Amino acid sequence: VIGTPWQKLDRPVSEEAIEGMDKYWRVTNYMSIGQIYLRSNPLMKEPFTRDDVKHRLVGHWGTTPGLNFLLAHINRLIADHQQNTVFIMGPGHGGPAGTSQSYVDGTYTEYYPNITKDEAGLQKFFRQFSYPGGIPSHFAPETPGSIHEGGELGYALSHAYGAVMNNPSLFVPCIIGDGEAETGPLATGWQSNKLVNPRTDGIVLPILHLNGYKIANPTILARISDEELHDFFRGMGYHPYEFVAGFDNEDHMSIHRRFAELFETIFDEICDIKAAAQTDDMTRPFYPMLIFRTPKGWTCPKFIDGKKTEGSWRAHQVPLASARDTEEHFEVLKGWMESYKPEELFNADGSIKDDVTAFMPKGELRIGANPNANGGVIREDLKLPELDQYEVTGVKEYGHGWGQVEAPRALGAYCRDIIKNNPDSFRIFGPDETASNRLNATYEVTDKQWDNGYLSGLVDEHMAVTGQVTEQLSEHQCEGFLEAYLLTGRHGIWSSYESFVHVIDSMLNQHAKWLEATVREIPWRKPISSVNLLVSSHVWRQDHNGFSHQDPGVTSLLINKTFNNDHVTNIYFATDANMLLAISEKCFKSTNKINAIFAGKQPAPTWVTLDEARAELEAGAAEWKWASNAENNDEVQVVLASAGDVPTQELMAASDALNKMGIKFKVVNVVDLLKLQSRENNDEALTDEEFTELFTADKPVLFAYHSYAQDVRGLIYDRPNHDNFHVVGYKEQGSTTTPFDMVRVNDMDRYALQAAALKLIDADKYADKIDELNAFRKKAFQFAVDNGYDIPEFTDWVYPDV
Amino acid sequence: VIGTPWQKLDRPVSEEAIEGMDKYWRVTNYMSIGQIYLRSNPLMKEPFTRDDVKHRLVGHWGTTPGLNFLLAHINRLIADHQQNTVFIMGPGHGGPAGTSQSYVDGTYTEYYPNITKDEAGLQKFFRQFSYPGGIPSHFAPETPGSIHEGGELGYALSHAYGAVMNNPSLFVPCIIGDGEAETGPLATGWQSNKLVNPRTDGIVLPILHLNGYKIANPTILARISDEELHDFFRGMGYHPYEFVAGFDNEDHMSIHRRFAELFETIFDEICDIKAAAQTDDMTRPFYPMLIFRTPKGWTCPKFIDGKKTEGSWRAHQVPLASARDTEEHFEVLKGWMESYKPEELFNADGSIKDDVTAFMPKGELRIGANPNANGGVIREDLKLPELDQYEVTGVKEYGHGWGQVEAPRALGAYCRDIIKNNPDSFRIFGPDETASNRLNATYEVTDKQWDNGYLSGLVDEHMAVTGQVTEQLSEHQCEGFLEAYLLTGRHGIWSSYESFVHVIDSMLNQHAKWLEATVREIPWRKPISSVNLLVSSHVWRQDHNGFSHQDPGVTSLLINKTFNNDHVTNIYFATDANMLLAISEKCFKSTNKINAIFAGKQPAPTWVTLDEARAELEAGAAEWKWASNAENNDEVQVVLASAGDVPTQELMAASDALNKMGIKFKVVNVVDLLKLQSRENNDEALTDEEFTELFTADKPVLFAYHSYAQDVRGLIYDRPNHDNFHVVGYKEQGSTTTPFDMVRVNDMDRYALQAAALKLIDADKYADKIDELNAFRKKAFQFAVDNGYDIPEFTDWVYPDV
Ligand SMILES: CC1=C(CCOP(=O)(O)OP(=O)(O)O)S/C(=C(/O)CO)N1Cc1cnc(C)nc1N
Ligand SMILES: CC1=C(CCOP(=O)(O)OP(=O)(O)O)S/C(=C(/O)CO)N1Cc1cnc(C)nc1N
Ligand SMILES: [Mg+2]
Ligand SMILES: [Mg+2]
Ligand code: NA
Do A663 and A590 form a contact (C-beta atoms < 8 A)?
no
DSSP assigned state of A213: B
Query: Which residues does B639 contact at the CB level (< 8 Å), separation at least 6?
Result: B665, B666, B668, B694, B695, B696, B699, B700, B701, B702, B703
Do B63 and B71 form a contact (C-beta atoms < 8 A)?
no
Dihedrals phi, psi of A119, to nearest 5 degrees: -65, -40
Do B293 and B242 form a contact (C-beta atoms < 8 A)?
yes
Handedness of CA A472, A477, A478, A484 (dihedral sign): negative
Give the pairing type, strands B287-293 and B303-304. unpaired
DSSP assigned state of B307: E
SS3 A120: helix
User: Is the Cβ pair A224, B138 closer than 8 Å?
Assistant: no
**How far apart (Å, rounded) are the C-alpha atoms in residues A514 and A566?**
11
Dihedrals phi, psi of B427, to nearest 5 degrees: -120, 150
- Secondary structure (DSSP) of B533-546: EEEES-TT--TTT-
Closest CA to A183 of B479, B474, B482, B154: B474
DSSP assigned state of A527: P
Q: Hey, what amino acid is at A355?
A: D
Buried/exposed B201-229: b ≥16 CB within 10 Å, e otherwise: bbbbbbbbbbbbbbbbbbbbbbbbeeebb
Helical axes A408-421 vs A577-589, angle rounded to 10°? 30
* Best residue for ligand 2 mutational test, from B153, B209, B291 (most atoms within 8 Å of Cβ): B153
SS3 A89: strand
Q: Hey, what amino acid is at B220?
A: I
Containing A705, the helix (H) or strand (E) segment is strand A701-705
Do B127 and B134 form a contact (C-beta atoms < 8 A)?
yes
Helical axes A327-338 vs A15-37, angle rounded to 10°? 160
Ligand 1 lined by A182 (C-beta under 6 Å): no
**How far apart (Å, rounded) are the C-alpha atoms in residues B576 and B588?**
18
- Secondary structure (DSSP) of A576-645: SHHHHHHHHHHHHH-BS-EEEEE---SEEEE-S-HHHHHHHHHHSEEE-TTT---SSSTT-SEEEEEESH
Do B387 and B395 form a contact (C-beta atoms < 8 A)?
no
Where in A390-454 does DSSP place strands (E)?
402-406, 426-430, 448-449
Helix, strand and coil in chain B, % to nearest 5: 45, 15, 40
What are chain B's domains? 1-386 (3.40.50.970), 403-620 (3.40.50.970), 621-802 (3.40.50.920)
> Breaks in chain A at C–N > 2.5 Å: after which residues?
none
**How far apart (Å, rounded) are the C-alpha atoms in residues A267 and A352?**
29
Ligand 2 lined by A49 (C-beta under 6 Å): no
* B708 and A CB contact within 8 Å: yes
**How far apart (Å, rounded) are the C-alpha atoms in residues A220 and A182?**
7
Gyration radius (Cα) of chain A, Å: 30
> What sections of B190-251 are H helices per DSSP?
220-223, 226-235
| Beta pairing partners, B173 | B205
C-alpha pair distances (Å), B259 with each of A152, B66, B631 = 44, 13, 81
Do B192 and B544 form a contact (C-beta atoms < 8 A)?
no
Do B546 and A129 form a contact (C-beta atoms < 8 A)?
no
- Contacts with A516 from chain B: Cβ below 8 Å: 547, 732
Give contacts of B 215-254 with A, CB under 8 A.
215-220, 223-225, 228-237
**How far apart (Å, rounded) are the C-alpha atoms in residues A482 and A476?**
10
Helical axes B156-164 vs B475-487, angle rounded to 10°? 50
**How far apart (Å, rounded) are the C-alpha atoms in residues A174 and A289?**
9
Chain centroid to CA B341: 42
> Breaks in chain B at C–N > 2.5 Å: after which residues?
none
| Beta pairing partners, B534 | B495, B597
* Residue B753 C-beta-side C-alpha neighbours within 13 Å: 32
**How far apart (Å, rounded) are the C-alpha atoms in residues B555 and B544?**
24
> What sections of A119-251 are H helices per DSSP?
119-128, 156-164, 184-189, 220-223, 226-235
DSSP assigned state of A235: H
**How far apart (Å, rounded) are the C-alpha atoms in residues B737 and A241?**
41
Chain centroid to CA A64: 25
- Structure obtained using: X-ray
Q: How many residues does chain A have?
A: 802
* Dihedral of the alpha carbons of A687, A689, A691, A697, in degrees to the nearest 10: 150
Do A80 and A9 form a contact (C-beta atoms < 8 A)?
yes
Q: Output A735-738 pairs: Cβ under 8 A, ≥24 positions apart.
A: A735/A546, A735/A547, A735/B136, A736/A542, A736/A543, A736/A544, A736/A545, A736/A546, A736/B58, A736/B130, A736/B131, A736/B134, A736/B135, A736/B136, A736/B137, A737/A784, A737/B131, A737/B132, A738/A784, A738/A789, A738/A790, A738/B56, A738/B132
Do A219 and A213 form a contact (C-beta atoms < 8 A)?
yes
| Beta pairing partners, A684 | none
| Beta pairing partners, B535 | B496, B598
Q: A503, A681, A786, A795: best mutation site toward chain B, by most B Cβ within 10 Å?
A: A503
* Dihedral of the alpha carbons of B607, B613, B618, B622, in degrees to the nearest 10: -30
- Secondary structure (DSSP) of B680-721: TT-TTSPPHHHHHHHH-SSS-EEEEESS-HHHHHHHTTTSTT
Which residue on chain B is closest to A497 by alpha carbon?
B152
Resolution at which this structure was determined, Å: 2.1
CB count in 10 Å sphere of residue B16:
11
Q: A131, A309, A313, A474: best mutation site toward chain B, by most B Cβ within 10 Å?
A: A474
Give the pairing type, strands A463-464 and A491-497. unpaired
Buried/exposed A50-78: b ≥16 CB within 10 Å, e otherwise: bebbbebbbbbbbbbbbbbbbbbbbbbbb
Query: Which residues does A326 contact at the CB level (< 8 Å), separation at least 6?
Result: none
* A666 and B CB contact within 8 Å: no
**How far apart (Å, rounded) are the C-alpha atoms in residues A679 and A632?**
25
* Dihedral of the alpha carbons of B365, B368, B374, B379, in degrees to the nearest 10: -20
Closest CA to A281 of A224, A200, A342, A191: A200
Of B179, B473, B548, the CB nearest to A179: B473
* B528 and A CB contact within 8 Å: no
Ligand 2 lined by B358 (C-beta under 6 Å): no
Classify residue A384 as exposed, middle or buried by CB count within 10 Å of its CB (0-12, 13-18, 19+). Answer: middle
Where in B469-520 does DSSP place strands (E)?
469-471, 491-497
SS3 B761: helix
DSSP assigned state of A352: B
Between the two ends of chain A, the Cα-to-Cα distance in Å is 56
Dihedrals phi, psi of A252, to nearest 5 degrees: -65, -40
**How far apart (Å, rounded) are the C-alpha atoms in residues B324 and B330?**
6
Closest CA to B655 of B617, B610, B625, B611: B625
C-alpha pair distances (Å), A2 with each of A6, A9, A81, A146, A203 = 11, 17, 11, 18, 15
Chain centroid to CA B255: 38
**How far apart (Å, rounded) are the C-alpha atoms in residues A86 and A146?**
8
| Beta pairing partners, A57 | none
Three-point CA angle B341, B343, B347, nearest 5° = 140
**How far apart (Å, rounded) are the C-alpha atoms in residues B441 and B418?**
12
Give the pairing type, strands B638-643 and B665-670. parallel
User: Is the Cβ pair B223, A448 closer than 8 Å?
Assistant: no
User: Is the Cβ pair B217, A471 closer than 8 Å?
Assistant: yes
User: Is the Cβ pair A708, B317 closer than 8 Å?
Assistant: no
Closest CA to A319 of A60, A676, A588: A60
**How far apart (Å, rounded) are the C-alpha atoms in residues A48 and A126?**
15
DSSP assigned state of A313: G
Dihedrals phi, psi of A329, to nearest 5 degrees: -70, -35
Three-point CA angle A140, A142, A145, nearest 5° = 80
**How far apart (Å, rounded) are the C-alpha atoms in residues B750 and B648?**
9
Which residue on chain B is closest to A459 by alpha carbon?
B312
Dihedrals phi, psi of B585, to nearest 5 degrees: -55, -50
SS3 A178: coil
CB count in 10 Å sphere of residue A354:
9
CB count in 10 Å sphere of residue A687:
10
**How far apart (Å, rounded) are the C-alpha atoms in residues A676 and A685?**
6
* B551 and A CB contact within 8 Å: yes
Query: Which residues does B46 contact at the CB level (< 8 Å), separation at least 6?
Result: none
Closest CA to B595 of B673, B489, B699: B673
Three-point CA angle B723, B727, B730, nearest 5° = 155
Q: Output A270-278 pairs: Cβ under 8 A, ≥24 positions apart.
A: A270/A6, A270/A171, A270/A203, A270/A205, A271/A6, A271/A7, A271/A8, A273/A198, A273/A203, A274/A5, A274/A6, A274/A198, A274/A203, A275/A6, A276/A198, A277/A197, A277/A198, A277/A199, A278/A199
Give the pairing type, strands A303-304 and A307-308. antiparallel
* A464 and B CB contact within 8 Å: no
* Residue A411 C-beta-side C-alpha neighbours within 13 Å: 36
**How far apart (Å, rounded) are the C-alpha atoms in residues B137 and B134?**
10
- Secondary structure (DSSP) of A143-172: STT-S---SS-S-HHHHHHHHHTT-TT-EE
Give the pairing type, strands B594-598 and B603-606. unpaired
- Contacts with A140 from chain B: Cβ below 8 Å: 546-547
Query: Which residues does B285 contact at the CB level (< 8 Å), separation at least 6?
Result: B198, B273, B276, B277
* Best residue for ligand 2 mutational test, from A432, A434, A479 (most atoms within 8 Å of Cβ): A432
Dihedrals phi, psi of B145, to nearest 5 degrees: 100, -10
C-alpha pair distances (Å), A8 with each of A73, A78, A264, A265, B736 = 15, 11, 8, 9, 42
Q: Hey, what amino acid is at B263?
A: F
H helix count then E strand count, chain A? 26, 22
| Beta pairing partners, A672 | A572
Edge-to-edge strand ranges of the sheet holding B88-89: B88-89, B171-177, B203-210, B287-293, B238-244
Between the two ends of chain B, the Cα-to-Cα distance in Å is 56
Query: Which residues does A370 contact at the CB level (< 8 Å), separation at least 6?
Result: A2, A84, A85, A86, A145, A364
Ligand 1 lined by A193 (C-beta under 6 Å): no
Q: Output B677-682 pairs: Cβ under 8 A, ≥24 positions apart.
A: B677/B562, B677/B715, B677/B716, B678/B718, B678/B719, B680/B718, B681/B562, B681/B718, B682/B562, B682/B565
**How far apart (Å, rounded) are the C-alpha atoms in residues B521 and B564?**
13
